[PDB]
């Protein structure tokens, strides 16, 4: 079921049980937003390593009625107790990734549930209870785990062994393997609380309190006041033109939209389909282009509530033409650094350019 066709609706997800649940919402006359909410709950249960109400996301919605594109932004927020140097040791050295990525200081205030409710309020036509219930069933009665979840449990067993996860995912100190039934009674109970009370159980309730308590147990600063402060935002897409199409993508606080658009603007003039898709020329020009866009990303991108990202400058056609002068089949560019997109818009950055060690993942 890698490819599908349908007259009246389409679902594509990373888990077949989540795709089936999404499809069923559309089969019962729910809209794409109804189905997407059902899908997030189902992935939370079936692909628990990748996403869920412990995290955050960017949900882009094109509204077929208003013809407006908007994004429900449930990106997590640092708690009030976070400090700029909290990932440095007392000698100012970066704490290794395998240590800091497992510490309570790493946990952002989760937004995913807030985002599902914001989406539901705006576009929802099914009762929230109809959308969460298929996931309660999978959590309650269990499902046989897929190869990617079995591989994930195996690869992350060190991390999972030191937390309350070991009891569900490492039974008898052994990783669940493909086909084993994963039963998540406590997750079913959490979904039942949300089904009964809605998100106040999370952001102003016993789930929020338990989150704050375990974050503090692992050395983090998050309190119930951090959870009660949290709200999602609604973003407009960043737009770019490519090849006769208009592309809507994710603005800051993602780097994704602007740098995906910047790469397409930088390579468009190279007409890459003159070269075989597996040619030296295509791979070389993409590598040279990525080096420039990722260098800009490391210097210029952050939360636009805190810092000014030069979006106009980064996509300016003269900035594009200046950066293209570094991209060539004649050689590899060994002097890769951010450009100066501030040269092409009003104002100045309110930050320094601070080199970071290459240590994430």
């Amino acid at each position: 079921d890698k490819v599908a066709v349908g007259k009246d609706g389409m679902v594509a997800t990373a888990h077949p049980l989540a795709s089936k649940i999404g499809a069923e919402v559309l089969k019962k006359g729910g809209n794409a937003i109804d189905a997407a909410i059902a899908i997030q709950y189902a992935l939370n249960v079936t692909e628990p390593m990748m996403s869920g109400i412990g995290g955050g996301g960017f949900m882009m919605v094109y509204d077929g009625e208003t013809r407006e594109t908007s994004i429900i932004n449930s990106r997590e927020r640092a708690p009030e107790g976070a400090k700029p140097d909290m990932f440095l040791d007392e000698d100012g050295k970066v704490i290794p990734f395998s240590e800091r990525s497992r510490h309570g200081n790493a946990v952002g205030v989760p937004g995913t549930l807030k985002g599902l409710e914001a989406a539901h309020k705006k576009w929802g036509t099914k009762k929230m209870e109809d959308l969460i219930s298929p996931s309660i069933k999978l959590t309650e009665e269990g499902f046989p785990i897929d190869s990617v979840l079995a591989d994930a449990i195996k690869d992350h067993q060190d991390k999972l062994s030191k937390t309350a996860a070991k009891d569900i995912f490492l039974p008898d100190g052994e990783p669940l393997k493909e086909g084993d039934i994963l039963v998540q009674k406590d997750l079913a109970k959490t979904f039942k609380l949300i089904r009964k009370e809605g998100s106040k159980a999370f952001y102003d309730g016993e789930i929020g309190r338990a989150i704050a308590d375990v974050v503090q147990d692992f050395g983090g600063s998050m309190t119930p006041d951090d959870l009660s402060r949290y709200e999602v935002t609604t973003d407009k897409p960043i737009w770019g033109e490519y090849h006769g199409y208009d592309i809507a993508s994710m603005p800051p606080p993602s780097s994704g939209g602007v740098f995906m658009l910047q790469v397409l603007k930088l390579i468009d003039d190279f007409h890459l389909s003159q070269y075989d898709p597996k040619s030296f020329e295509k791979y070389h020009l993409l590598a040279e282009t990525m080096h420039l866009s990722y260098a800009d990303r490391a210097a210029y991108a952050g939360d636009p509530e805190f810092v000014d990202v030069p979006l106009r400058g980064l996509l300016d056609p003269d900035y594009i033409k200046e950066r293209q002068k570094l991209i060539s089949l004649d050689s590899m560019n060994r002097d890769v650094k951010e450009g100066d997109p501030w040269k092409y818009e009003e104002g100045e950055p309110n930050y320094e350019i601070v080199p970071q060690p290459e240590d994430k993942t």
């Binding site: 077949p16 189905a35 955050g56 995906m260 990525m290």
Partner: protein, 182 residues
């Protein structure tokens, strides 16, 4: 991270990327509540002073790239992917392969991707020819001996000529596309 997409009979289109950062996030499961807690704040710079420094109530910089492509103001293609900084690479290469190369949606997705964020960091999917890999490296690149899967693109094409939707799930996970009729 995971990316999914939905289209309905009323012209609504969803492109949704969602994450807890690392696989299982911090690995912390809320005792008695069964949910994993994100490590999203490690997406901040560990060394402050920059645009993406840690601050209280700040959102750490993401690379998530949920995307909708339009033709004459009408949505025609959804794109997104997991994979941290590589997401940008998965999304632009899919779009390049579809619109610039004119591949089928499934070919655009399955075509081996490359990623390099710096002179010291290269990844490539199996299918890059060995001889081309050697030529790239002789020229100054650092594609290693081992290929790795990059990202996981789910996409829907909205076919107004054929009055259909086409859904594609990347082979890099066990994802599926499921179409709906009346």
């Amino acid at each position: 991270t995971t990316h999914f997409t939905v289209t309905d009979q009323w012209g609504n289109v969803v492109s949704y990327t969602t994450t807890i950062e690392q696989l299982f996030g911090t690995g912390i499961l809320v005792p008695g509540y069964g949910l994993f807690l994100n490590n999203e704040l490690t997406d901040f710079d560990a060394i402050p002073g920059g645009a993406n420094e840690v601050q209280p109530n700040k959102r750490p910089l993401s690379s998530m790239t949920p995307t909708i492509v339009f033709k004459d103001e009408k949505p025609v293609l959804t794109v997104g992917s997991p994979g941290g900084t590589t997401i940008i690479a998965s999304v632009f290469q899919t779009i390049l392969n579809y619109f610039e190369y004119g591949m089928s949606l499934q070919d655009a997705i399955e075509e081996p991707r490359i990623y390099t964020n710096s002179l010291t960091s290269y990844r490539y999917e199996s299918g890059m020819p060995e001889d081309v890999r050697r030529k790239l490296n002789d020229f100054g690149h650092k594609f290693g001996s081992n290929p790795v899967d990059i990202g996981n693109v789910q996409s829907i094409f909205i076919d107004r000529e054929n009055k259909t939707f086409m859904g594609v799930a990347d082979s890099s996970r066990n994802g599926t596309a499921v179409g709906v009729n009346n």
